C-alpha cells in the first residue's frame, strides 16, 4: 500500500555535451541510481527505487512499468495518481505528455516519443471497448498558476474555479466550476488534450523550450455499471509539476518563487508523513491541497522523480533523490469506490 517511486535520468543535452559536463549520475540494474566522485569514479551515493530509468530509456517502457498496472486498478474503482517531480528541464513534461500527437490508430505499447497521458487514454479505451459494462468517461484538465486555478478546457474566462476541502471522504477536495467533459472516443480525448496543451502556461527557455510555468493535472473519471446493479467509480490523475530551480524582477521571478514555494510545501508534506509529525501541512499550498488525497490518502500513487546526470545540477538532483527515497515510506489506504446501486 506504499507509494511507488521511480527515477528517470534524462540524457545530457547538446549544450551540456559541448562544454563536456561531468556525468556523475548512473543507473545500475533495474532499480538503482548511483552518484560517482568526479576525481576517482568511486560511488558516493546509492538509492534504490521501484524502478530506475537511464538516459536510453524509452517512453513505452516508462509507461509499461509505471502506469499500465494502474489502468486495471482505475477500472476496479480505485483513485490512482501519477506525478512527475524534479528540477526544471529534467524531463517531467516529456515523460507525462511528450510532444508528438497520438495517431487514432496507435497502441499504448508503441515505441514512439509519445508520453504517458496519450498512452493511458489509448489503454483505457482499449480496455473499456472489451468490457461488458455501461460506462461514462469525463475529462478535466486543471492548471495551478501563481496559486490561481485555471480550467485548460474552457474556451473563455467566464467561469470562476473554487476549491472546497471535501465531503464524507474527509481528506479530499471539490473543485467547483471545472469542466468535466464527457468523451466517447480516443479521437474526442486526443482533441481535448491537444486544445488544453495549447493553453498551458509555458516559457521558451534555453534547452527547455516549453518550460512549464504551472502545475497541471489531467484527470480521467470513469463510472462503470456491470451488465443489485454494481456501480464502480475509478479515477486517474496524471500530474505534471513545474520544476524547482536553484535561485531578476518580473513575472518570471514571481513564477519561480511560487513554483519553488509550492514544491517546498510538497517536500514538507512528504517529510511530515514519513517523520509521522502530528500536523501534515497540506493546507499551506494549493498544490498540496490538490495532492492531499494522493499523499497518505485513499489512492494508489506513483511518483516519477526526474533528474539531470550533470555535476552542475548535483545539489538539486540530491534534493530530488532524497525526497523521492523518503516518499517510498508513505503508506496510502486505497479503497474501491463502489456506490452499491
Ligand atoms: N528522456 C529524454 N530524452 C530526450 N530528450 C529529453 C528527455 N527528457 C527531456 N528531454 C528534453 O529536455 C527538454 C526539457 O524537457 P521537459 O520534459 O520539457 O522538462 P521539464 O522537466 O518539464 N521542465 P520544467 O517544466 O521547466 O520543469 C525538452 O526539449 C525535452 O525534449
Ligand atoms: Mg515541464
Short mmCIF file of C-alpha atoms and ligand atoms in Angstrom, two decimals:
data_model
loop_
_atom_site.label_atom_id
_atom_site.label_comp_id
_atom_site.label_asym_id
_atom_site.label_seq_id
_atom_site.Cartn_x
_atom_site.Cartn_y
_atom_site.Cartn_z
CA UNK A 1 0.00 0.00 0.00
CA UNK A 2 3.11 2.28 -0.05
CA UNK A 3 3.61 4.96 -2.69
CA UNK A 4 5.60 3.54 -5.62
CA UNK A 5 8.61 5.70 -6.58
CA UNK A 6 10.55 5.72 -9.86
CA UNK A 7 13.55 7.73 -11.07
CA UNK A 8 14.19 8.84 -14.67
CA UNK A 9 17.58 10.28 -15.66
CA UNK A 10 17.42 12.37 -18.89
CA UNK A 11 20.32 12.33 -21.36
CA UNK A 12 22.90 15.15 -21.35
CA UNK A 13 21.61 17.79 -23.83
CA UNK A 14 23.61 19.35 -26.72
CA UNK A 15 24.70 22.39 -24.65
CA UNK A 16 25.91 20.11 -21.76
CA UNK A 17 27.70 17.90 -24.35
CA UNK A 18 29.52 20.86 -25.95
CA UNK A 19 31.01 22.09 -22.62
CA UNK A 20 31.72 18.40 -21.61
CA UNK A 21 29.61 18.47 -18.37
CA UNK A 22 30.77 15.82 -15.84
CA UNK A 23 28.19 12.95 -15.89
CA UNK A 24 28.11 11.85 -12.22
CA UNK A 25 24.71 10.07 -12.08
CA UNK A 26 24.42 6.42 -13.28
CA UNK A 27 21.51 3.92 -13.38
CA UNK A 28 22.70 0.42 -12.33
CA UNK A 29 20.49 -2.60 -12.94
CA UNK A 30 16.77 -2.07 -12.92
CA UNK A 31 16.28 -0.27 -9.58
CA UNK A 32 19.39 1.65 -8.51
CA UNK A 33 20.67 5.17 -9.11
CA UNK A 34 24.25 5.98 -8.02
CA UNK A 35 26.34 9.15 -7.88
CA UNK A 36 30.06 8.93 -8.64
CA UNK A 37 33.03 11.01 -7.32
CA UNK A 38 34.47 13.29 -10.06
CA UNK A 39 38.11 12.54 -9.03
CA UNK A 40 38.13 8.67 -8.91
CA UNK A 41 34.71 7.42 -10.23
CA UNK A 42 34.02 5.72 -6.82
CA UNK A 43 30.31 5.52 -5.76
CA UNK A 44 29.36 8.25 -3.27
CA UNK A 45 25.57 7.58 -3.05
CA UNK A 46 23.24 4.71 -3.96
CA UNK A 47 19.42 4.99 -3.92
CA UNK A 48 17.01 2.11 -4.67
CA UNK A 49 13.58 2.70 -6.30
CA UNK A 50 10.70 0.57 -7.60
CA UNK A 51 12.43 1.09 -10.98
CA UNK A 52 15.18 3.39 -12.29
CA UNK A 53 15.28 4.54 -15.94
CA UNK A 54 18.51 5.62 -17.52
CA UNK A 55 19.18 8.08 -20.34
CA UNK A 56 18.44 5.49 -23.13
CA UNK A 57 15.03 4.62 -21.52
CA UNK A 58 12.04 4.54 -23.90
CA UNK A 59 8.62 6.29 -23.41
CA UNK A 60 6.87 2.86 -23.98
CA UNK A 61 8.89 1.21 -21.10
CA UNK A 62 8.25 4.06 -18.59
CA UNK A 63 4.51 3.72 -19.40
CA UNK A 64 4.60 -0.12 -19.22
CA UNK A 65 6.28 -0.23 -15.78
CA UNK A 66 4.76 2.82 -14.04
CA UNK A 67 1.28 3.39 -15.48
CA UNK A 68 -0.07 0.30 -17.25
CA UNK A 69 -0.62 -1.59 -13.90
CA UNK A 70 -2.82 1.32 -12.61
CA UNK A 71 -5.24 1.06 -15.56
CA UNK A 72 -6.59 -2.19 -14.11
CA UNK A 73 -6.99 -0.53 -10.68
CA UNK A 74 -8.90 2.51 -12.17
CA UNK A 75 -11.28 0.02 -13.91
CA UNK A 76 -11.75 -1.69 -10.49
CA UNK A 77 -12.90 1.60 -8.83
CA UNK A 78 -9.59 2.88 -7.36
CA UNK A 79 -8.38 6.50 -7.34
CA UNK A 80 -4.87 6.43 -8.94
CA UNK A 81 -2.30 9.27 -9.25
CA UNK A 82 0.98 9.55 -11.12
CA UNK A 83 3.01 12.74 -10.62
CA UNK A 84 6.34 13.79 -12.15
CA UNK A 85 8.58 15.74 -9.80
CA UNK A 86 12.05 17.30 -10.24
CA UNK A 87 14.37 20.19 -11.22
CA UNK A 88 13.44 22.46 -14.18
CA UNK A 89 14.42 20.91 -17.54
CA UNK A 90 14.84 17.29 -16.31
CA UNK A 91 12.04 15.69 -18.37
CA UNK A 92 8.75 15.93 -16.49
CA UNK A 93 6.62 17.16 -19.42
CA UNK A 94 8.49 14.88 -21.87
CA UNK A 95 7.61 11.96 -19.57
CA UNK A 96 3.99 12.89 -18.71
CA UNK A 97 2.76 14.28 -22.07
CA UNK A 98 5.53 14.39 -24.70
CA UNK A 99 5.36 16.40 -27.98
CA UNK A 100 4.02 14.06 -30.78
CA UNK A 101 0.16 13.90 -31.07
CA UNK A 102 -1.15 10.26 -30.96
CA UNK A 103 -2.45 8.66 -34.21
CA UNK A 104 -6.07 7.39 -33.72
CA UNK A 105 -4.62 4.00 -34.65
CA UNK A 106 -1.59 3.78 -32.26
CA UNK A 107 -1.24 1.44 -29.21
CA UNK A 108 -0.02 2.34 -25.66
CA UNK A 109 2.72 -0.33 -26.40
CA UNK A 110 4.14 1.55 -29.46
CA UNK A 111 7.82 2.58 -29.37
CA UNK A 112 7.50 6.38 -30.08
CA UNK A 113 8.16 9.79 -28.38
CA UNK A 114 4.56 9.98 -27.07
CA UNK A 115 4.39 10.24 -23.22
CA UNK A 116 2.09 8.89 -20.51
CA UNK A 117 -1.24 10.84 -20.88
CA UNK A 118 -1.97 9.70 -24.50
CA UNK A 119 -0.87 6.10 -23.78
CA UNK A 120 -3.15 6.00 -20.67
CA UNK A 121 -6.17 7.34 -22.69
CA UNK A 122 -5.49 4.82 -25.50
CA UNK A 123 -5.11 1.93 -22.99
CA UNK A 124 -8.27 2.85 -21.04
CA UNK A 125 -10.43 2.95 -24.23
CA UNK A 126 -8.88 -0.36 -25.40
CA UNK A 127 -9.95 -1.98 -22.08
CA UNK A 128 -13.41 -0.32 -21.92
CA UNK A 129 -14.11 -1.48 -25.59
CA UNK A 130 -13.93 -5.13 -24.39
CA UNK A 131 -15.89 -4.76 -21.12
CA UNK A 132 -19.49 -5.96 -20.76
CA UNK A 133 -20.47 -2.77 -18.90
CA UNK A 134 -22.12 0.61 -19.35
CA UNK A 135 -19.61 3.40 -18.66
CA UNK A 136 -19.20 7.16 -18.73
CA UNK A 137 -15.75 8.88 -19.00
CA UNK A 138 -15.32 12.57 -18.08
CA UNK A 139 -12.05 14.51 -18.50
CA UNK A 140 -10.83 17.60 -16.72
CA UNK A 141 -7.57 19.49 -17.19
CA UNK A 142 -6.68 21.89 -14.36
CA UNK A 143 -3.78 24.34 -14.12
CA UNK A 144 -2.39 25.90 -10.94
CA UNK A 145 -0.50 29.05 -11.98
CA UNK A 146 0.92 31.58 -9.48
CA UNK A 147 -1.51 29.99 -6.87
CA UNK A 148 -4.61 30.53 -9.07
CA UNK A 149 -6.70 27.67 -10.59
CA UNK A 150 -7.38 27.73 -14.39
CA UNK A 151 -9.52 25.32 -16.47
CA UNK A 152 -7.43 24.34 -19.56
CA UNK A 153 -10.60 23.03 -21.34
CA UNK A 154 -12.58 26.37 -21.00
CA UNK A 155 -12.77 28.49 -24.24
CA UNK A 156 -13.29 31.76 -22.25
CA UNK A 157 -12.52 33.49 -18.87
CA UNK A 158 -16.26 33.40 -17.97
CA UNK A 159 -16.33 30.67 -15.17
CA UNK A 160 -14.70 31.03 -11.69
CA UNK A 161 -12.81 27.91 -10.29
CA UNK A 162 -13.00 27.35 -6.49
CA UNK A 163 -11.57 24.57 -4.25
CA UNK A 164 -13.51 23.27 -1.20
CA UNK A 165 -11.96 20.85 1.38
CA UNK A 166 -14.08 17.70 0.78
CA UNK A 167 -17.20 15.68 1.79
CA UNK A 168 -17.60 12.20 3.54
CA UNK A 169 -14.10 11.13 2.25
CA UNK A 170 -12.91 13.83 4.81
CA UNK A 171 -9.36 14.02 3.26
CA UNK A 172 -10.16 15.28 -0.29
CA UNK A 173 -11.14 18.41 -2.37
CA UNK A 174 -14.14 19.50 -4.52
CA UNK A 175 -13.31 21.86 -7.47
CA UNK A 176 -16.38 23.98 -8.37
CA UNK A 177 -16.65 25.28 -11.97
CA UNK A 178 -14.07 22.98 -13.54
CA UNK A 179 -15.31 21.42 -16.86
CA UNK A 180 -15.86 17.60 -16.59
CA UNK A 181 -16.25 16.87 -20.29
CA UNK A 182 -17.88 13.60 -21.40
CA UNK A 183 -15.78 11.77 -24.05
CA UNK A 184 -16.92 8.80 -26.13
CA UNK A 185 -13.78 8.01 -28.21
CA UNK A 186 -9.96 8.25 -28.33
CA UNK A 187 -10.49 10.96 -31.05
CA UNK A 188 -12.59 13.01 -28.60
CA UNK A 189 -9.96 12.85 -25.76
CA UNK A 190 -6.98 13.42 -28.13
CA UNK A 191 -8.77 16.59 -29.43
CA UNK A 192 -9.30 17.80 -25.79
CA UNK A 193 -5.69 17.06 -24.70
CA UNK A 194 -4.38 18.97 -27.73
CA UNK A 195 -6.64 22.04 -27.01
CA UNK A 196 -5.69 22.03 -23.33
CA UNK A 197 -1.98 21.57 -24.08
CA UNK A 198 -2.02 24.75 -26.19
CA UNK A 199 -3.47 26.75 -23.21
CA UNK A 200 -0.74 25.68 -20.67
CA UNK A 201 1.42 28.48 -19.25
CA UNK A 202 4.89 27.90 -20.70
CA UNK A 203 8.15 29.83 -21.34
CA UNK A 204 10.70 29.33 -24.19
CA UNK A 205 13.89 28.66 -22.06
CA UNK A 206 17.35 27.52 -23.38
CA UNK A 207 17.31 23.61 -23.59
CA UNK A 208 13.76 23.86 -22.06
CA UNK A 209 11.80 25.47 -24.89
CA UNK A 210 8.36 24.54 -23.42
CA UNK A 211 9.30 25.06 -19.68
CA UNK A 212 6.13 24.51 -17.56
CA UNK A 213 5.32 27.71 -15.61
CA UNK A 214 2.27 25.99 -13.98
CA UNK A 215 1.40 22.67 -12.34
CA UNK A 216 -1.13 20.72 -14.46
CA UNK A 217 -3.49 17.85 -13.52
CA UNK A 218 -5.20 15.75 -16.23
CA UNK A 219 -8.00 13.75 -14.56
CA UNK A 220 -9.98 10.86 -16.08
CA UNK A 221 -13.09 9.74 -14.16
CA UNK A 222 -14.87 6.52 -15.21
CA UNK A 223 -18.32 5.40 -13.92
CA UNK A 224 -18.73 1.62 -14.70
CA UNK A 225 -22.08 -0.21 -14.14
CA UNK A 226 -21.79 -4.00 -14.69
CA UNK A 227 -24.33 -5.53 -17.20
CA UNK A 228 -28.07 -5.49 -7.33
CA UNK A 229 -26.50 -3.37 -10.16
CA UNK A 230 -22.86 -2.66 -9.12
CA UNK A 231 -21.50 0.87 -9.90
CA UNK A 232 -17.70 1.49 -9.56
CA UNK A 233 -16.06 4.92 -9.96
CA UNK A 234 -12.37 4.91 -11.00
CA UNK A 235 -10.11 7.98 -11.30
CA UNK A 236 -6.73 8.51 -12.90
CA UNK A 237 -4.90 11.75 -12.12
CA UNK A 238 -1.87 12.44 -14.30
CA UNK A 239 0.13 15.30 -12.82
CA UNK A 240 2.93 17.29 -14.45
CA UNK A 241 4.58 19.57 -11.85
CA UNK A 242 6.59 22.72 -12.75
CA UNK A 243 10.33 22.22 -11.90
CA UNK A 244 12.34 23.58 -8.96
CA UNK A 245 15.19 25.95 -9.72
CA UNK A 246 18.32 26.76 -7.62
CA UNK A 247 17.84 30.50 -7.07
CA UNK A 248 15.59 39.16 -11.62
CA UNK A 249 12.40 41.15 -11.18
CA UNK A 250 9.28 40.33 -13.17
CA UNK A 251 6.62 37.71 -13.80
CA UNK A 252 9.41 35.13 -14.44
CA UNK A 253 10.87 35.56 -10.91
CA UNK A 254 7.33 35.61 -9.31
CA UNK A 255 6.64 32.28 -11.11
CA UNK A 256 9.97 30.83 -9.86
CA UNK A 257 9.16 31.95 -6.27
CA UNK A 258 5.63 30.44 -6.41
CA UNK A 259 6.85 27.17 -8.08
CA UNK A 260 9.72 26.76 -5.58
CA UNK A 261 7.43 27.58 -2.53
CA UNK A 262 4.69 25.10 -3.64
CA UNK A 263 7.45 22.40 -4.12
CA UNK A 264 8.97 23.23 -0.73
CA UNK A 265 5.47 22.70 0.76
CA UNK A 266 5.24 19.31 -1.08
CA UNK A 267 8.64 18.38 0.48
CA UNK A 268 7.36 19.44 3.96
CA UNK A 269 4.24 17.26 3.39
CA UNK A 270 6.44 14.24 2.40
CA UNK A 271 8.74 14.84 5.43
CA UNK A 272 5.78 15.26 7.86
CA UNK A 273 4.23 11.99 6.60
CA UNK A 274 7.48 9.96 6.83
CA UNK A 275 8.60 11.55 10.18
CA UNK A 276 4.98 10.95 11.50
CA UNK A 277 4.65 14.62 12.62
CA UNK A 278 1.14 15.31 14.06
CA UNK A 279 0.38 18.16 11.54
CA UNK A 280 0.85 17.48 7.81
CA UNK A 281 0.89 20.94 6.18
CA UNK A 282 -1.34 20.14 3.17
CA UNK A 283 -3.23 23.43 3.50
CA UNK A 284 -0.01 25.53 3.17
CA UNK A 285 -0.18 25.26 -0.66
CA UNK A 286 -2.96 24.89 -3.28
CA UNK A 287 -0.68 22.17 -4.80
CA UNK A 288 -0.65 20.08 -1.60
CA UNK A 289 -4.42 20.67 -1.17
CA UNK A 290 -4.86 19.09 -4.66
CA UNK A 291 -2.35 16.26 -3.95
CA UNK A 292 -3.61 15.64 -0.35
CA UNK A 293 -5.66 12.52 -1.26
CA UNK A 294 -2.62 11.13 -3.18
CA UNK A 295 -0.18 11.58 -0.20
CA UNK A 296 -1.17 9.26 2.73
CA UNK A 297 -4.79 9.10 1.44
CA UNK A 298 -7.21 6.74 -0.37
CA UNK A 299 -5.27 6.47 -3.66
CA UNK A 300 -2.69 4.32 -5.40
CA UNK A 301 0.09 6.81 -6.09
CA UNK A 302 3.20 6.55 -8.17
CA UNK A 303 5.90 9.20 -8.34
CA UNK A 304 8.35 9.73 -11.23
CA UNK A 305 11.32 11.76 -9.93
CA UNK A 306 13.27 13.25 -12.90
CA UNK A 307 16.93 14.19 -12.62
CA UNK A 308 19.81 15.54 -14.69
CA UNK A 309 23.08 13.49 -14.83
CA UNK A 310 25.38 16.63 -14.71
CA UNK A 311 27.65 17.66 -11.77
CA UNK A 312 26.40 21.31 -12.19
CA UNK A 313 22.93 20.05 -11.00
CA UNK A 314 24.05 17.60 -8.22
CA UNK A 315 22.59 19.69 -5.28
CA UNK A 316 19.13 19.85 -7.00
CA UNK A 317 19.44 16.17 -8.07
CA UNK A 318 20.32 15.01 -4.48
CA UNK A 319 17.32 17.01 -3.09
CA UNK A 320 15.01 15.29 -5.60
CA UNK A 321 16.52 11.83 -4.89
CA UNK A 322 16.36 12.34 -1.10
CA UNK A 323 12.65 13.46 -1.19
CA UNK A 324 11.84 10.56 -3.61
CA UNK A 325 13.72 7.98 -1.43
CA UNK A 326 11.71 9.16 1.67
CA UNK A 327 8.33 9.15 -0.18
CA UNK A 328 8.68 5.32 -0.66
CA UNK A 329 7.84 5.06 3.07
CA UNK A 330 4.42 6.87 2.71
CA UNK A 331 1.56 4.43 3.39
CA UNK A 332 -1.66 5.03 1.43
CA UNK A 333 -5.03 3.35 2.14
CA UNK A 334 -6.64 2.78 -1.29
CA UNK A 335 -10.34 1.82 -1.27
CA UNK A 336 -12.73 0.77 -4.09
CA UNK A 337 -15.39 3.42 -4.84
CA UNK A 338 -18.45 1.13 -5.21
CA UNK A 339 -21.67 3.18 -4.75
CA UNK A 340 -23.72 -0.11 -4.50
CA UNK A 341 -26.73 0.74 -6.93
N1 LIG B 1 14.39 11.32 -21.94
C1 LIG B 1 14.62 12.34 -22.74
N2 LIG B 1 15.16 12.09 -23.96
C2 LIG B 1 15.36 13.14 -24.78
N3 LIG B 1 15.07 14.44 -24.60
C3 LIG B 1 14.57 14.64 -23.37
C4 LIG B 1 14.30 13.68 -22.43
N4 LIG B 1 13.75 14.27 -21.30
C5 LIG B 1 13.68 15.55 -21.59
N5 LIG B 1 14.17 15.84 -22.84
C6 LIG B 1 14.24 17.13 -23.45
O1 LIG B 1 14.67 18.08 -22.50
C7 LIG B 1 13.90 19.30 -22.64
C8 LIG B 1 13.21 19.62 -21.33
O2 LIG B 1 12.23 18.59 -21.10
P1 LIG B 1 10.83 18.85 -20.40
O3 LIG B 1 10.25 17.48 -20.23
O4 LIG B 1 10.04 19.89 -21.05
O5 LIG B 1 11.35 19.41 -19.00
P2 LIG B 1 10.53 19.70 -17.66
O6 LIG B 1 11.12 18.87 -16.54
O7 LIG B 1 9.06 19.57 -17.91
N6 LIG B 1 10.88 21.27 -17.43
P3 LIG B 1 10.09 22.31 -16.47
O8 LIG B 1 8.67 22.29 -16.88
O9 LIG B 1 10.59 23.71 -16.70
O10 LIG B 1 10.26 21.91 -15.03
C9 LIG B 1 12.94 19.08 -23.80
O11 LIG B 1 13.44 19.60 -25.02
C10 LIG B 1 12.85 17.56 -23.90
O12 LIG B 1 12.58 17.13 -25.22
MG1 LIG B 2 7.57 20.78 -17.82
#
